[PDB]
């Protein structure tokens, strides 16, 4: 198996907006950003699905 | 100002789709993802400075 990483930089206030929006539901900014990107691209997709986490 | 960083993982197919969608305009996939998040979260940011040099 393989994985395809993503890594970048942001402003103080931008990262703090992501931190607040994460902490409101899921206090893990990296997991929240991955979820944000996935949901904003597509929702209830048919290409693949899962029922567990790392 | 200081800078704040974000790191996570994607699957082969979703990263390859985002690589194609990036390559259509700005092939730097992590910059394309940064731009996607920024455009979704905010559209009237107060200032947009840069600090690059020769």
Automatic annotation (TrEMBL), chains A, B:
Source taxon at top rank: Bacteria
GO biological process: one example: regulation of DNA-templated transcription
Name of the protein described by the UniProt record: Putative
Organism: Helicobacter pylori (strain J99 / ATCC 700824) (Campylobacter pylori J99)
């Amino acid at each position: 198996k393989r994985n395809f990483s993503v890594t970048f930089y942001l402003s103080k206030e931008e990262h703090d907006v992501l931190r607040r929006l994460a902490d409101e539901e899921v206090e893990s900014v990296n997991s929240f950003v991955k979820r944000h990107i996935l949901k904003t691209i597509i929702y209830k997709k048919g290409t693949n699905q899962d029922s567990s986490i790392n």
